[PDB]
């Protein structure tokens, strides 16, 4: 509505939740802010690997959204968008209802593209996922089934994956949990399959000594590792893998039996968003400018995994660079600021800032973390760290993030990085 | 003078120079700001090791102070304080002149305590220093003399030292320069002597994997390393060393011939400051509070190496924790803010912030850096990094810092750490 613009935020995840609060905080009581998401609960996704091995419960890492955002004056609709007509600016929900918007802020994260690898969907074979708590709970249940009936383990990342950290994390804690159950010696073979050109490439051409450290780690745990691999199909509990060389030629094909498995899938854009004509690249990722504004529709903004970021390298086997938390927050802040500026007749000039990747993996008593920026080398910061303190930090950050998602944020997010003052 | 208070800044070094500008910027044209220092030039001290091996010239890393601060309205006096009467608030200069102050900001850095080890003064034996460009130039001249007449090399850090980084740096680049001259094989023995309880303790109980990395480094270069060592005397070109165990007992004594040497000395407070009654601890370091204000004299503030920081551990052989650049700047900012507040009838509440150490060592094509905070473990940040990018950063930072010392700072120093926005 004119003068009382209605802003809709699609997706209540790492970018979406904060976007809701920030938007409402910025616009005030004169504008309608509606948050629409497929689930009625928020989940802290960096914790999913731990759920997948049973180190955490769903209840530890998730909570119902409604109360917390409604107490802030945000309208919550727990329904997935099935369709977005950008011309009429209407969104059709799963239940057939439709919602109009004056501005749209898309934060739908990834579609897990299991279909790239026939048989790889967690519901159709032994290869599970820890990308969502629903999947991680299923991974754990299968993990227990491996405990009762031991057989070969296969963990890694598919062709086109962009989130490698968690595969390493999951492989280490599995190994770790297998020992603490005195069950490790009952595993016939524990294999790490990755699409990375080398161990610890991480989709970012490596950070610090991640190659050396992740390699050593997989050896400590007795995990055999293969790089430059694409899984072509999962079938009869066997993983068909092709391994290439620097020039894409095939150097071998393997068939790996799998009693228990977990492969990071490739990410695509969700269907409702990918389905909007001229909105997205062929991956279904929203093409936006420096200001987070759709290049096709001026009243559509995007943040998080949903946006497209051009590649800067090409690997023998296709891989993506990850989109991580601090950068997503920069995107969210910028989108909110610029939408606000639009509502006030200005060109918002705020941008995402410098590309960066930050990731924290907890392996139990200690953890690994990295910070890399910008995307291309030589970087301004290229750090890989390991220690008990990385563990303590992950723990503290999750405690913090979840609290903030309940109390609300205003909130130039990341006064966390102010533990100096 | 009443209403036109006169602020004097003693020492034009890493804290002192910025303090001068910041002070003047903060107080404005209504107050006299005078900067007093022993040298008429500013020097970027982190570059001294490179001068010491001849990779840099004095002219690359130093410049005359007067013009640059006078163009800002700051009075410059190139004379050392010989005496400070805190009662009368007068400072006596080397030439016998005296200067009155309403507020005193002490930034005199360290007295290099060669006297702790008889014979160790660079003017009385083969053991040189790279702490100042004057000394580093002398180190280099002796280095050349070693080239013409090869013999044993000894590099390290004395008992009571608090700046270890640069010893490692200097040892590596010496080794490095020896190879590039095809002269390394002409060295009979290259020994690293340190007061640290172990390699890469760095006076901070280690950071990340500094133990493993510095150890490996000294092996690559063929340098034999001894920890828990105190030098007792230098005499007849021989270094008399005592090595202790965890419990301070002696486990051996060595006599090492030295053709070329460089040991980081212990730091004490300069005489003029240490000489002020009740001002300092027995080391001659100014006892200040959280706000950088002397605990004895309310109109005396201090920043930089000049202040006392209580130890948090005790090593078999006495060692200190380093006081590094970013923390010194926090000290300076706080002192300036709180002096300003005093001039305006408020209690300044600003503090140094969290204790931290940050250090960058360039070894030529690549460098090592670390960040640790706070002082005690487990830390919130405990990182040790190595790579070409650390080199690129040191280079960029020096270029930047020196520029800022000429243009002036206002200047909530460290918008450098804003290469995100
Ligand atoms: C296992 C795991 C570990 C990770 N570890 C880290 C880490 O250590 N540090 C880091 O910085 N990053 C981490 N990431 C990367 C990144 O931070 C997360 O993936 C993050 O959650 C992405 O946030 P988002 O807002 O883009 O997407 P999401 O958090 O996935 O949120 C998208 C939301 O949109 C909803 N949605 C989707 N489709 C629709 C639809 N059609 N209609 C309505 N709602 C819809 C979903 O339900 C979801 O709530 C991790 C990623 C994963 C998977
Ligand atoms: C070789 C070397 C490498 C270092 N590397 C790093 C690094 O990588 N990163 C980092 O953060 N820190 C580094 N440091 C540590 C620290 O940052 C420096 O020592 C820094 O210069 C200390 O600043 P300051 O202001 O306390 O003392 P200084 O820079 O030493 O300045 C003190 C000033 O006071 C003057 N003065 C002394 N006595 C008198 C007197 N009686 N009257 C008048 N003037 C006087 C001196 O001439 C000098 O100008 C390094 C230290 C050294 C020695
Ligand atoms: C140079 C930039 C440093 C910023 C990061 C330091 C502290 C926060 C860690 C990053 C992080 C963010 C932002 C984050 O949003 C997130 O949740 C999705 C994490 O998972 C635990 C993160 O690790
Ligand atoms: C967590 C805090 C990080 C701050 C440091 C990042 C960039 C600057 C490096 C620190 C530094 C400072 C402050 C500094 O003042 C200085 O000169 C004495 C250095 O020597 C090169 C430094 O390396
Ligand atoms: Au995933
Ligand atoms: Au990721
Ligand atoms: Au990702
Ligand atoms: Au020194
Ligand atoms: Au130092
Ligand atoms: Au120091
Ligand atoms: S990652
Ligand atoms: S991603
Ligand atoms: S990640
Ligand atoms: S240091
Ligand atoms: S120091
Ligand atoms: S240092």
């Amino acid at each position: 509505m004119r003068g009382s613009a209605h802003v809709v935020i699609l997706g209540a995840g790492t970018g979406g939740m904060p976007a809701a609060y920030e938007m409402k905080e910025a616009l005030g009581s004169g504008h309608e802010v509606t948050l629409i998401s497929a689930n009625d609960y928020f989940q802290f996704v960096p914790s999913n690997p731990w759920v997948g091995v049973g180190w955490k419960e769903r209840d530890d890492i998730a909570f119902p959204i409604r109360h917390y955002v409604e107490r802030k004056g945000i309208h919550f609709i727990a329904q997935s968008a099935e369709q977005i007509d950008a011309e009429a600016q209407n969104i059709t929900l799963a239940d057939g209802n439709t919602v109009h918007y004056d501005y749209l802020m898309i934060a739908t994260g990834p579609k897990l593209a299991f279909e790239n690898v026939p048989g790889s969907d967690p519901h159709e074979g032994p290869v599970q996922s820890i990308c969502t708590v629903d999947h991680a709970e299923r991974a754990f249940a299968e993990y227990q089934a491996l405990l009762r009936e031991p057989g070969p383990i296969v963990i890694g990342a598919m062709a086109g994956a962009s989130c490698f950290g968690p595969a390493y994390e999951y492989a280490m804690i599995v190994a770790s949990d297998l020992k603490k159950r005195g069950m490790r010696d009952k595993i016939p073979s524990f294999t790490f399959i990755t699409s990375e050109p080398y161990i610890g490439h991480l989709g970012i051409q490596g950070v610090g000594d991640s190659k050396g450290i992740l390699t050593k780690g997989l050896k400590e745990e007795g995990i055999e590792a293969y790089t430059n691999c694409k899984v072509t199909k999962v079938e009869d509990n066997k993983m068909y893998v092709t391994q290439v060389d620097e020039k894409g030629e095939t150097i071998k094909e393997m068939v790996l039996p799998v009693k228990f498995g977990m492969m990071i899938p490739a990410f695509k854009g969700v269907p409702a968003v990918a389905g909007v004509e001229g909105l997205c690249n062929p991956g279904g990722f929203v093409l936006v400018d420096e200001h987070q504004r759709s290049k096709k529709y001026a009243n559509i903004f995007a943040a998080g995994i949903a946006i497209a970021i051009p590649p800067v390298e090409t690997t023998p086997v296709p891989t993506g660079a990850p989109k991580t938390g601090y950068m997503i927050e920069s995107m969210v802040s910028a989108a909110v600021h610029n939408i606000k500026a639009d509502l006030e007749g200005r060109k918002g000039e705020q941008t995402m800032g410098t590309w960066n990747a930050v990731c924290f993996a907890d392996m139990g008593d200690r953890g690994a973390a990295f910070i890399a920026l910008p995307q291309l080398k030589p970087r301004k910061v290229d750090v890989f760290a390991y220690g008990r303190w990385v563990h303590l930090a992950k723990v503290a950050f999750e405690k913090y993030f979840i609290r903030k998602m309940k109390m609300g944020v205003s909130e130039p997010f990341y006064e966390k990085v102010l533990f100096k003052m």
Side-chain angles (χ1 to χ4, degrees), chain A residues 2-19:
Chain A
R2 305 276 292 178
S4 309
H6 184 195
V7 183
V8 170
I9 297 168
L10 214 207
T14 306
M17 271 273 289

Side-chain angles (χ1 to χ4, degrees), chain A residues 85-102:
Chain A
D85 170 12
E87 297 297 341
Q89 314 174 11
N90 280 326
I91 302 169
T92 300
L93 306 174
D95 67 5
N97 231 271
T98 128
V99 170
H100 186 267
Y101 66 80
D102 300 308

Side-chain angles (χ1 to χ4, degrees), chain A residues 52-74:
Chain A
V53 75
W55 286 1
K56 272 176 181 179
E57 297 274 49
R58 170 190 291 274
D59 325 82
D60 290 327
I61 74 156
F63 65 86
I65 289 162
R66 188 169 306 279
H67 181 62
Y68 304 103
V69 304
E70 273 175 4
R71 79 186 327 177
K72 265 56 175 67
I74 308 167

Side-chain angles (χ1 to χ4, degrees), chain A residues 33 51 200 233 336 350 404:
Chain A
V33 176
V51 181
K233 71 181 179 207
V336 173
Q350 177 165 340
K404 273 305 195 289

Side-chain angles (χ1 to χ4, degrees), chain A residues 162-163 267 305 322-323:
Chain A
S162 56
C163 200
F267 290 160
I305 287 176
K323 303 155 183 168

Side-chain angles (χ1 to χ4, degrees), chain A residues 8 23 103-107 286 288-289 291-294 297-303 307 331 334-340 342:
Chain A
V8 170
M23 197 69 67
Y103 289 89
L104 179 53
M105 158 82 149
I106 290 167
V286 184
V288 304
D289 58 18
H291 313 299
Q292 308 300 136
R293 188 190 302 268
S294 154
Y297 300 94
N299 59 344
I300 299 190
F301 283 79
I307 77 159
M331 289 185 213
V336 173
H337 181 275
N338 299 327
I339 285 177
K340 182 177 183 183
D342 257 52

